[PDB]
Amino acid sequence: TQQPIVTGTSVISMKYDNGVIIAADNLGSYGSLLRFNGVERLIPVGDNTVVGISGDISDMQHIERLLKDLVTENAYDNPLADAEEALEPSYIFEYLATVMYQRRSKMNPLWNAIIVAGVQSNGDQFLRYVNLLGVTYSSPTLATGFGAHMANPLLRKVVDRESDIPKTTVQVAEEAIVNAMRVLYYRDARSSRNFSLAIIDKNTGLTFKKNLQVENMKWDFAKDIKGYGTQKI
Amino acid sequence: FRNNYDGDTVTFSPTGRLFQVEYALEAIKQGSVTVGLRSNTHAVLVALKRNADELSSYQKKIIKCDEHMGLSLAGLAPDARVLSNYLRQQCNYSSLVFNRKLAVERAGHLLCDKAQKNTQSYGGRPYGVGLLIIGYDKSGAHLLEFQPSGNVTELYGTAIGARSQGAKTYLERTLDTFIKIDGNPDELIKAGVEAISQSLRDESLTVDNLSIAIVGKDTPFTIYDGEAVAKYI
């Protein structure tokens, strides 16, 4: 049993017709201190999988080492390591889910919320979540922490059910994701303006965008607001 | 000579030989014959079951390890039970932890290493059984030959046991032919029964005497015995 120290906030994601999109800002909080700003919380595994992590950063780094090892180990005595026998997003997830549940079962959890996004070898999209309790679930859209409360409602307006997937394009999806990130920047006190976004498309492959920034924010209406009730000036 | 260097597996002879391993290999040669061959869509196992009396049964020689993998044994049956059980567990681990079916090539590496440990340590003994492993994984049909020395090899076809040499030359001849028996299991099996009968001498393969197993593209590893093999005699 422990307590998170340096933490990463929301991780949001959704799937579109040709793949999945996942994003997460670059902040590493220390309580209410916005302590670190160059933290990458999206971990690419191979070229068909990206793992988004929130929660304790020290544990995130541990999961990173684990993922690198998975790649190294899968390459051993594997002549088809970059072909038929490369790591599938589902393998990477089942692995992490296993670890997450074993650790909570030993009363020593990896204090994180994880979302594994990718495209299977047969082209199928992959989006599944696992957290410190070992709980897992899939949905056309998935978000952790604050994003679960504010991103999902927005992302679900694009893909409310399975049949909305084929009707959604990368442009629509990426736009929804970028807007959600802005909303989270407005209301989440542990969020950052800088973030990374990655797309895993069954045709274009893995696109990993770094250093994005929330833009087009509305703040002007603030000038009109004064006092907290009766004040006029 | 030999007598002074064949007391245990931890001793090299003056020429670099390991007699205990070689004596274990001898248990295989004394074992009933079994054959294996594969095309590009299937892999088949044909084995001659041996009986003690005409009042006894014909000891099974094929063990299923998973829905996509199985093997045939020649030599000490108990040692086959042990090794196949270890294989069943490795296949199981792969599915439960990684939601991935174990690659036949990996299964072979695992077996090789398990046998190798009983050839470099004091107190233990080499395994006294040979195994033929067939399976369909993410890279098609496969056939492996396992020797107690720890040597495992991937082939298009092969045979082990007494008089196995007959069937083996036959396959080395029929190669270009059966390797193309794709999409037609009955043919591959017949081609197997023909290879195995090339090692007969005592009697002729009867109904409760022949044992066949197959696995492939859309065929879970299944074992056929008795009436089920009648249509092949």
Side-chain angles (χ1 to χ4, degrees):
Chain A
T1 293
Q2 42 174 101
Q3 63 173 306
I5 310 287
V6 179
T7 55
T9 190
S10 304
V11 171
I12 63 171
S13 65
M14 66 179 299
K15 43 174 69 172
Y16 56 98
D17 57 33
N18 293 165
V20 308
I21 295 181
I22 186 168
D25 72 13
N26 310 320
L27 180 60
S29 305
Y30 182 84
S32 54
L33 169 58
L34 311 172
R35 202 174 186 179
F36 305 117
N37 281 93
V39 189
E40 182 52 64
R41 306 195 287 106
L42 295 189
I43 289 66
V45 184
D47 61 14
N48 57 175
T49 302
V50 170
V51 180
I53 305 174
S54 57
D56 189 86
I57 296 313
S58 78
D59 285 340
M60 180 188 77
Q61 298 181 341
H62 170 77
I63 291 163
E64 271 193 270
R65 193 176 70 57
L66 292 184
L67 289 174
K68 293 185 172 186
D69 287 29
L70 232 191
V71 173
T72 299
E73 216 90 24
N74 179 73
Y76 291 162
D77 311 333
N78 190 20
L80 306 179
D82 50 39
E84 291 80 10
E85 295 296 351
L87 288 171
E88 279 286 76
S90 64
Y91 305 160
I92 296 161
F93 174 88
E94 204 65 11
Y95 172 63
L96 294 178
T98 292
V99 171
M100 298 308 272
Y101 187 70
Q102 282 171 176
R103 292 290 296 264
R104 92 93 219 201
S105 290
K106 289 189 184 64
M107 291 300 277
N108 181 196
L110 281 173
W111 214 278
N112 308 102
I114 301 174
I115 291 177
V116 174
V119 182
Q120 296 292 86
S121 69
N122 74 346
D124 291 355
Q125 302 98 317
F126 186 92
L127 202 63
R128 203 166 174 71
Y129 164 114
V130 67
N131 66 19
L132 76 166
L133 291 171
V135 174
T136 76
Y137 48 74
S138 271
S139 186
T141 72
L142 291 171
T144 68
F146 253 105
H149 299 106
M150 301 191 88
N152 282 322
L154 301 180
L155 301 186
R156 285 170 186 171
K157 279 163 82 69
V158 171
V159 302
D160 209 14
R161 72 260 308 314
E162 201 73 9
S163 58
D164 290 350
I165 310 293
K167 306 173 184 179
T168 309
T169 71
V170 206
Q171 294 77 196
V172 182
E174 186 177 6
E175 186 183 305
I177 290 287
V178 177
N179 174 243
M181 294 298 297
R182 171 178 41 244
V183 173
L184 297 176
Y185 184 55
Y186 285 146
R187 323 306 296 212
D188 182 354
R190 300 284 175 277
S191 67
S192 175
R193 184 171 182 168
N194 298 95
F195 71 99
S196 303
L197 181 151
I199 312 178
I200 295 83
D201 184 277
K202 71 177 178 182
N203 296 308
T204 55
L206 184 174
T207 308
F208 192 105
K209 311 184 183 187
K210 278 173 156 289
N211 308 97
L212 279 47
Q213 269 210 178
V214 176
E215 302 291 4
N216 308 295
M217 303 188 294
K218 299 189 180 70
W219 285 103
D220 189 271
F221 64 102
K223 72 186 188 306
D224 301 318
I225 293 172
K226 50 261 182 193
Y228 48 72
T230 64
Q231 188 170 299
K232 289 170 177 169
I233 69 187
Chain B
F1 189 60
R2 196 176 68 173
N3 185 60
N4 269 148
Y5 307 91
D6 65 353
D8 44 60
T9 328
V10 76
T11 306
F12 269 121
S13 68
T15 55
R17 305 169 60 178
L18 299 175
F19 289 108
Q20 273 297 303
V21 176
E22 286 177 43
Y23 295 171
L25 266 38
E26 189 61 25
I28 298 164
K29 259 81 79 61
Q30 183 186 178
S32 178
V33 69
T34 185
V35 185
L37 71 174
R38 75 174 187 73
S39 67
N40 282 293
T41 63
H42 296 60
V44 181
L45 280 179
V46 191
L48 182 60
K49 299 187 290 181
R50 175 185 293 165
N51 66 303
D53 279 60
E54 249 54 32
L55 281 54
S56 86
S57 58
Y58 292 68
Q59 182 159 294
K60 69 170 182 293
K61 305 234 299 177
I62 301 175
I63 318 286
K64 174 182 183 180
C65 294
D66 204 354
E67 297 300 307
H68 69 109
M69 209 187 286
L71 79 214
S72 60
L73 66 94
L76 290 183
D79 284 8
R81 175 169 167 57
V82 170
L83 292 174
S84 61
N85 196 267
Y86 170 73
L87 196 51
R88 282 172 168 178
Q89 303 178 310
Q90 287 307 302
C91 282
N92 220 199
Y93 185 81
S94 195
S95 295
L96 302 171
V97 173
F98 301 94
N99 191 190
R100 176 187 201 172
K101 296 176 188 178
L102 191 67
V104 180
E105 168 152 358
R106 187 125 188 298
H109 297 315
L110 292 169
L111 286 174
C112 156
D113 297 341
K114 201 196 197 313
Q116 192 280 160
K117 288 164 190 161
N118 301 197
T119 76
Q120 195 166 192
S121 298
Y122 179 64
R125 72 174 172 68
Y127 287 87
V129 66
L131 305 160
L132 298 186
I133 310 153
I134 61 157
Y136 199 74
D137 61 28
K138 269 199 168 188
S139 69
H142 299 277
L143 174 58
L144 258 43
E145 192 189 315
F146 165 83
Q147 288 303 312
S149 57
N151 288 292
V152 176
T153 306
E154 187 167 1
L155 313 153
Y156 290 109
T158 190
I160 53 175
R163 311 152 178 172
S164 61
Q165 188 47 286
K168 201 165 184 174
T169 303
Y170 163 89
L171 291 173
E172 195 165 356
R173 216 285 181 181
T174 308
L175 187 51
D176 299 359
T177 302
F178 68 65
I179 180 187
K180 296 174 59 181
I181 309 298
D182 304 311
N184 195 179
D186 295 307
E187 276 309 81
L188 237 193
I189 297 181
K190 281 178 170 63
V193 177
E194 187 164 68
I196 201 171
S197 40
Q198 222 66 194
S199 294
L200 300 173
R201 178 176 173 180
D202 180 66
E203 60 173 304
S204 178
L205 44 180
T206 75
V207 77
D208 41 48
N209 165 52
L210 179 65
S211 187
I212 306 175
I214 190 174
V215 63
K217 210 168 190 174
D218 280 345
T219 316
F221 182 103
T222 49
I223 300 169
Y224 299 124
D225 289 297
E227 354 56 60
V229 301
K231 72 274 290 187
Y232 293 92
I233 303 173

